[PDB]
Amino acid sequence: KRKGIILAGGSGTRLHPATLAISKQLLPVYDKPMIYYPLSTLMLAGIREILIISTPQDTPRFQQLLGDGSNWGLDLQYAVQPSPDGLAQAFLIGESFIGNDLSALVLGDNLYYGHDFHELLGSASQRQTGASVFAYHVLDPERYGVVEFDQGGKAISLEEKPLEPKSNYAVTGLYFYDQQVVDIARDLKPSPRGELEITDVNRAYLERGQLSVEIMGRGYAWLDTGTHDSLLEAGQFIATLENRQGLKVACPEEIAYRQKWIDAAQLEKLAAPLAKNGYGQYLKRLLTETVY
Amino acid sequence: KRKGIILAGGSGTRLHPATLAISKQLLPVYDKPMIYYPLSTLMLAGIREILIISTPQDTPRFQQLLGDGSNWGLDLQYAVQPSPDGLAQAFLIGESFIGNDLSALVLGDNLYYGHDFHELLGSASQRQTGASVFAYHVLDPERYGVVEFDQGGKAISLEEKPLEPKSNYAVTGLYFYDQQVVDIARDLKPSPRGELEITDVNRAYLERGQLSVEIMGRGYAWLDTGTHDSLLEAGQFIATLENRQGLKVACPEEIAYRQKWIDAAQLEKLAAPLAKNGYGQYLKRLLTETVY
Amino acid sequence: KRKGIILAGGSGTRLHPATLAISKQLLPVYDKPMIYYPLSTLMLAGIREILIISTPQDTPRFQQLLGDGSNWGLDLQYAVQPSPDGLAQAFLIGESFIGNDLSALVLGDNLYYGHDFHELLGSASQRQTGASVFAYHVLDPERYGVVEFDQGGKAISLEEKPLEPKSNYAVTGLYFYDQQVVDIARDLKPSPRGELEITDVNRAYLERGQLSVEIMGRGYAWLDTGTHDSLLEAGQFIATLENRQGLKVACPEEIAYRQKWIDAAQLEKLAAPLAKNGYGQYLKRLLTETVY
Amino acid sequence: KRKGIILAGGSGTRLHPATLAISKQLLPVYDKPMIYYPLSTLMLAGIREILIISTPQDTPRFQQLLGDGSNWGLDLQYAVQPSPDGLAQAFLIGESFIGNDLSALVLGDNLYYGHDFHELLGSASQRQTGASVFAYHVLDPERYGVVEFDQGGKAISLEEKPLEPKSNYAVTGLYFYDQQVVDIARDLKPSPRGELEITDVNRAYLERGQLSVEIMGRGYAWLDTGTHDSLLEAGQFIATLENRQGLKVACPEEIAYRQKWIDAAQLEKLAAPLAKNGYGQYLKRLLTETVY
């Protein structure tokens, strides 16, 4: 078993004033709330016990949206981050939830998509030691954690938002950890940025030779909804795929069902209330259509 | 003086599950909350005393977002609609707010844009008799109120969502009324749809020869965000204009400044808490730029 | 009697490799060739006699697409620009075509759209002395002819691509001239960047107190297809309008019919060969539907 | 040894009037001509010897855009298809080019993208007996060749544009064939639509138990640029990927270099004439960056 966390707080300042009305993680990416996407990432990694961390004001809305997750065969729990003082705080806030288990953290505004993503998640999730992170070639690596490799392809340094990146490979917002993470987070001090950085967590594993950095190839989409423009692009991306395929990206209900965490009758039940719109009609179609 | 009403309730069924998260009128259109758009419409019609109607769960969140309106030189009030039992219910809920004044109703998910919109609005709003509605050529008139004209261009019938529309002219979700509307709404009975219909209101006016139907030409954009696809498209439309012009559509702060409802000093104050993003930067820039 | 010129040449080094295949003005913007847009602008300005300038290689193409114009009630003529040595060259190449008449120049990659644009063009067209241009607020004025206004809104200076723009107002690619333009253009010497600049022609009028600069308001859309991104956005812009309205933008046959330049009968013959697709069906519908 | 064919002709039919001036396969998909996309698919499949088939009027245009291929390490040949009389005509027109070799056909308006596409292609290319095709779940299967599967996942029938489709799986425009294909195509009679159908070619192999139908999973994008709306969607799709990643899709120069069909000296010589725009800057960057 691994336990997962979604970090779905922050201010969403870049998204002002849209986010005055509410969390960037409840606004829609095309047809469904942003949070569905990372939730689904965790689900596809075989994780069913998940803690959602948000701001004090938006926590209740997540709870209304998602509940305890039992309807979807999950065990969802909630905690508050008082202030967005770093990714690594997820491990302090979530210490008791983690207990002595393997864990995973996904950022609330990250969206992933691509052929065999299930396998890429499984590989990381099934490991039982160290840390795993994913490196993705981006245009503006300065906005992210940046991994440098040597000539042989081995990662040699990490830097958080460097003005002068040492490569174009960003560390994405998905991280898998062994039982060493909590203790590492606890010994962290705030960065000059004023945050407890996930990059310092990861450097600590790197230093001990225990960070696995796996390339996420160009054939995958890793997007993030942090800007007005990026959020619209993500929306359009999802739209184009779903209207082409007649299939939906990141339907928790679908994923649950395919993973056998809920059964046909349960799914039919989930569909009923949503039946007056296309999402409901889609859940129903899933009962009598085989999709490879 | 004319008083305004924003109907910002409904279930937003077509946007499920995105709207299980929050009211459709709190979702963004590109860069700002949907409600900014109809609010701006009323503002551009010279209306500053506005009633916002929403559901029992969301009415307070709109209150949370916009407060009493004084920071923007407006007088905003709030009322709850217990069930989305029809647009015409705005006049019963809003009966005491209206008093013996002229009124205007704008729908929460309607977005307008175009050259001389201010003039178009002013003309309807400055009339002191009958009713005024706007007729816009659409692809799928079956989804709206439809107005049929004689050979002479005079409006001769209205039908709500006809299976066989008599024309391609839709009645947009903006309505201006004299003192007769409250009594007309109070006598309406539910339609076969189970709704108290604005179309029936407008018909009563038409029957007494007191309905002005003005054409809103093809040069204007009238959009509604009722479906996932249309919400996205409105987002892209707005983004294209804004990214081209370096001007923003339906920024209430800007419009209030321009109508002299607030002065330079007030605007500098509104910009301050927003200064860390592009939207606050833009309000600041307006203090030192003449825009024609 | 005013004659039109469409300047549709230009290096394709930029949008290479897209434009290695097809010159820019032959590429579509959503559903019809780019040149339809500026062609429609001239038509909406009441101009029937039009000269299309392209590269030597592209003139046959333009001719194949458009012909002599007679089927749309136009008089189209063609000329070549060997080298893209400046917009003002259009008046040297077009000297014989213009003769002793008033003229208008439109850029081949410029798309305009908005309420009462007809009336806007008319105001410039009716002026018989001097020149008329339009000013549009843009995000990146450094990329255009920039017009500076004094505190009372009078145009006081023009600079082509200033490093330090004096305003955010661009002079758009739509220019109206009296009889003086050809001699002005003859006297011009190339600018530092080596082009015979339209900005210089406009300044010659300005220095004589004969330049009328009109504001093209923010309710108008003025787009150019100069970048991959900007072409894309212009495509989505037209698509949203067209799909919303069930009406099409810059359809020359429609414009010609509305202007009485061709009759019902002529339009039905234009429609027949296009009848298997949407565009021909749209033209047919125009025959049986009144559009205000 | 497998040879390739791109079929890049076609009525033009619809996209009128966008395609009066030129063929659909020369239109840009965001930043490069559409033909680059299927061209790159064959390249990614390890195919260097390719035949491009088009119309009398367009074949030349393709030749001018791409030449003989030698600068990209390719051997490109051209042939004309007099009338768009069916996809299986490619095997007639292409008979001498193919000789006794294995072959692959791709449709000129098909765009594929996804993680491990190269491995997907390889799998099919390495099967030297019979045929291989791909099945992709779509919303409107009635537009395509449709493939039906039994309860156990085996392909059991094909139907071209069926009125009542038996599944939602379309056969994509990418086909691998052994030596039997030419004769199979030779023996075909046109269908009740008037075409020599690839679906009949495919059926022929199926009826011999020699058709391999592989699932192309939902993690892949398979788009058809055959409508106005679909071309725009594909453009946005590419743009979103390229702008997020700083890597281009279907850049033949890159693919050639990565396959070692050209060396760095060659790649630099290709970058030179494009150096004044982003495209050439990208090529140059590829000489000094490792991309995984």
Ligand SMILES: Cc1cn([C@H]2C[C@H](O)[C@@H](CO)O2)c(=O)[nH]c1=O
């Ligand atoms: C810095 C920080 C970000 N976030 C959220 C916002 C986004 O979903 C994501 C990336 O910033 O993390 C938090 O929830 N807490 C924090 O301390």
Ligand SMILES: Cc1cn([C@H]2C[C@H](O)[C@@H](CO)O2)c(=O)[nH]c1=O
């Ligand atoms: C099976 C399945 C996959 N996916 C996603 C995971 C991948 O990014 C992609 C390919 O499996 O689709 C869903 O979003 N829902 C699903 O039910």
Ligand SMILES: Cc1cn([C@H]2C[C@H](O)[C@@H](CO)O2)c(=O)[nH]c1=O
């Ligand atoms: C029918 C109905 C709609 N609405 C809102 C939803 C949209 O913004 C719009 C049109 O359905 O009005 C209400 O607020 N109350 C209602 O009773």
Ligand SMILES: Cc1cn([C@H]2C[C@H](O)[C@@H](CO)O2)c(=O)[nH]c1=O
């Ligand atoms: C003046 C002004 C106009 N607008 C809108 C009103 C019209 O639809 C268009 C042209 O004035 O722009 C704004 O959104 N904000 C403004 O400050």
Ligand SMILES: Cc1cn([C@H]2C[C@H](O)[C@@H](CO)O2)c(=O)[nH]c1=O
């Ligand atoms: C500079 C120049 C541009 N152009 C065209 C390309 C575009 O449509 C536009 C603006 O750069 O004018 C010419 O046709 N000739 C020229 O000499």
Ligand SMILES: Cc1cn([C@H]2C[C@H](O)[C@@H](CO)O2)c(=O)[nH]c1=O
């Ligand atoms: C009347 C008409 C206008 N237009 C454009 C001109 C303007 O930008 C807008 C408003 O009339 O629509 C067309 O494209 N075609 C037409 O037939």
Ligand SMILES: Cc1cn([C@H]2C[C@H](O)[C@@H](CO)O2)c(=O)[nH]c1=O
């Ligand atoms: C039917 C047909 C299609 N095509 C092309 C047009 C498109 O790219 C594709 C599928 O319609 O094949 C031909 O080149 N020749 C043909 O005979």
Ligand SMILES: Cc1cn([C@H]2C[C@H](O)[C@@H](CO)O2)c(=O)[nH]c1=O
């Ligand atoms: C290696 C490489 C892949 N691709 C495409 C192929 C696949 O669809 C995707 C993943 O390798 O990207 C390119 O377009 N160019 C390339 O250079």
Ligand SMILES: O=P(O)(O)O[C@H]1O[C@H](CO)[C@@H](O)[C@H](O)[C@H]1O
């Ligand atoms: O989004 P943030 O909190 O500015 O940055 C976070 O985002 C990225 C993922 O989206 C990560 O690579 C960064 O290392 C992390 O700090």
Ligand SMILES: O=P(O)(O)O[C@H]1O[C@H](CO)[C@@H](O)[C@H](O)[C@H]1O
């Ligand atoms: O959106 P609704 O509740 O189905 O319909 C409402 O909105 C339309 C505008 O959006 C109007 O034409 C209809 O007359 C009105 O009933």
Ligand SMILES: O=P(O)(O)O[C@H]1O[C@H](CO)[C@@H](O)[C@H](O)[C@H]1O
């Ligand atoms: O596109 P160009 O030749 O760099 O620029 C031209 O186009 C602009 C509008 O499209 C004008 O404002 C410029 O004055 C003119 O030089």
Ligand SMILES: O=P(O)(O)O[C@H]1O[C@H](CO)[C@@H](O)[C@H](O)[C@H]1O
């Ligand atoms: O586009 P067409 O010629 O109608 O159809 C062709 O294209 C499709 C892919 O684009 C295939 O599934 C069809 O079997 C083929 O006949």
